[PDB]
């Protein structure tokens, strides 16, 4: 159930060789989805944004104040299927502001997503968001 | 040591939802590299081609006749580090025409690659090459 998440920054040279910088951090696979491998360019999405990107992105979604979106178009899990329908290979939720979403995401689900749904919080959520907020271009790799 | 490889074709709709088609096939992780997760757009590369692509591609390389390239610029493994230096997250070798490369690739290597090096052959190699030869655009996901 523990997800290892690596976030990669990269730059190429005149030589055409890449320079990379990697950050590791920890989250949990939701029972909502598959406990599998995923890797792709990060696309930061507002949660309301899930009420076009090239196939295979990893959505990063910071859940809002539950009393900021008291009447949500879809449930957290529905949002994640919506993301996958639109080409996401993985969804990471930052559930810091909305910890209650954990209970909904570790409900087992008959008919669960075929792709991973990871949640982070705490320090790991901060390190993730520090990068995705800074760099326009990053790559996430999810495992374990 | 067994690698599960999925090759994904995809098409989007006017709605912005993707239609996908997936093929599974089997290979082996080389000891040359890490027995880890990898996922990315496939880039078919001629082996001589490894004597610019966006970070995170999966190289697919059909090894040539050993008596076609009797004096190779680099070893099979060197070619794979070269691929990774140029942004590959994974290398798949089709070692059908050159089975001898297996012995070189299952040498343990102090200082092994940090990314996976998979080899396929037989029927699995055929299914892989059938797709990468047909579709300009595919995505590989490697695991297990």
Numbering used by the authors:
A (entry chain A), B (entry chain A): 54 to 104, 112 to 204
Tell me, in the authors' exact words, what the paper reports.
Rspo (R-spondin, also roof plate-specific spondin) proteins are evolutionarily conserved from fish to humans and have well-documented roles in a broad range of developmental and physiological processes resulting from enhancement of canonical and non-canonical Wnt signalling. ZNRF3/RNF43 specifically targets these Wnt receptors for ubiquitination and turnover, hence reducing Wnt signalling responses. Direct extracellular interaction with Rspo proteins inhibits ZNRF3/RNF43 activity. Here we report a molecular level analysis of the ZNRF3/RNF43 ectodomain structure and its interactions with Rspo proteins.
